Amino acid sequence: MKMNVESFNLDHTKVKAPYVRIADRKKGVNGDLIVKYDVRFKQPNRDHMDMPSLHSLEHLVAEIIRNHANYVVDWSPMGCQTGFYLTVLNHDNYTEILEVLEKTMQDVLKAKEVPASNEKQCGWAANHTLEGAQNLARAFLDKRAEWSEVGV
Amino acid sequence: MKMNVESFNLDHTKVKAPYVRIADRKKGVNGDLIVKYDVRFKQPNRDHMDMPSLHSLEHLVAEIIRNHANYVVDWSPMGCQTGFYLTVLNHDNYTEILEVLEKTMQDVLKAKEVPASNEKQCGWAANHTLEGAQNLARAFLDKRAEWSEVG
Ligand code: MET
Ligand code: MET
Ligand SMILES: [Zn+2]
Ligand SMILES: [Zn+2]
């Protein structure tokens, strides 16, 4: 059957994390294209990101990717804690997305702090960690070569 | 200082959960609209949702809401665990959003299982709870008359 939600149609047991998958392409009535990418850090049901590191990598990448790209719509963590969804508008070169992510992960490692990590600009300012975030980004980076190998 | 990220520009110490807030807008070069809504379940830095309940609510609303619309681009949980982001395409009607969210939450209470809570369709299948999700859905619903008052 075809599920209502795109990711419910992905066989999680066959993908090989880490990877960047074209999860969805929507073209608006006016022709504008919206593309969604499943950037998986951990292997489904085999591992996951602890919330403090996940939460910080969200602030860091959300803020930084937008320095390297003018077409980012959103960067949101998955509830399953194994990855993030990246949404872009009017951009459709898979390779350029990997380079943008690459440049972005590199700047995460050179970070000296986690952006807007206080009670004025965050709903849980306490739950943060730059080290964990950076640990996640380095690990993701170390397998850059495998990014386009989704596995299924 | 204005951050690249729009929610970083929201003064979290002046909002009052629960609430549904028009958080962002973007328009393609061809005219297509994208509106993102900040739907806050918990008071910032004063409370938060536990992951299993949040995870289950992600699944439930994500499937249930698209049974009621056909313009939903995405239903995503926030890293801070206090709310979700609702993204829509070519739909600019705040009132309808509240009603759809009202209908969605009601169906969530009639749900018998968290959909797709298995290892083939979920990245952490064991981390779920239907009841937990239904408890967040009931609370959110009880305070319905407040949804439009963000400040
Ligand atoms: C709280 S970090 C910002 C997350 C949001 N989904 C965005 O990319 O704008
Ligand atoms: C894991 S439920 C799917 C969530 C995703 N943000 C969507 O709206 O499709
Ligand atoms: Zn935050
Ligand atoms: Zn899941």
- For residue A69, what is the domain's CATH number? 3.30.1360.80
Cα(B134)–Cα(B149) distance, integer angstroms: 23
Amino acid A85 reads Y
* B39 touches B61 (CB < 8 A): no
**Cα B117 from Cα A45, distance rounded (Å):** 11
Q: How far apart are CA B25 and CA B38, in angstroms?
A: 12
For ligand 2, what atom is nearest to the CA of residue B74? 8
Among B74, B88, B127, which is best to mutate for testing ligand 2, by the most ligand atoms less than 8 A from CB?
Answer: B74
Query: Which residues in A4-23 are b (16+ Cβ under 10 Å) and which e?
Result: bbbbbebebeebebbbbbeb
- Residues B108 and A60: their CA atoms lie apart, in Å, by 33
B63 bridge partner residues = none
**What single letter denotes the amino acid at residue A76?**
S
Burial class (CB in 10 A: 0-12, 13-18, 19+), A103: middle
Residue A122 with chain B: CB contacts under 8 Å: 8, 12, 44-45, 80
Distances (CA, A) of B139 to A23, B6, B10, B41, B82: 33, 27, 24, 9, 13
User: Contact at 8 Å (CB) between A122 and B44?
Assistant: yes
Q: Provide the phi-psi class of B9: left if phi over 0, else alpha when psi is between -120 and 50, else beta.
A: alpha
Domain that includes residue A57, residue range: 2-152
Strand order in the sheet with A72-77: A19-27, A33-40, A83-89, A72-77
What's the rounded Cα separation, in Å, for the pair B123 and B120? 8
Give the total number of structural domains in chain B.
1
- Residue labelled with tokens 């609702």: B86
Backbone angles phi, psi at A136, to 5 degrees: -65, -45
Please check if B80 is assigned to a binding site.
no
- Which amino acid belongs to residue A38? D
Q: What tokens were used for B138?
A: 């009931």
Which tokens in the block code for residue B120? Answer: 């083939």
H or E element that contains A26: strand A19-27
What does the buried/exposed string (b/e) look like for A106-137 if buried means 16 or more CB atoms within 10 Å of the residue's CB?
ebbeebeebbbbeeebbbbbebbbbebbbebb
- φ/ψ of residue B88, rounded to 5: -125, 155
Interface of B with A in 8-47 (CB under 8 A): 8-13, 26, 28-32, 34, 36, 40, 42, 44-45
Tokens of A75: 């960067």
- Sequence letter at residue B64: I
Report residue B57: phi and psi, to 5°: -70, -35
Cα(B44)–Cα(B82) distance, integer angstroms: 7
- To one decimal, the resolution in angstroms is 2.4
Amino acid (1-letter code) at residue A114: V
Technique used to solve these coordinates: X-ray
Residue for token pair 């990246």: A86
Amino acid of residue B92: D
CA-CA-CA-CA torsion sign (B25, A8, B77, B97): positive
- Please give the Cα distance from B54 to B134 (Å, whole number): 10
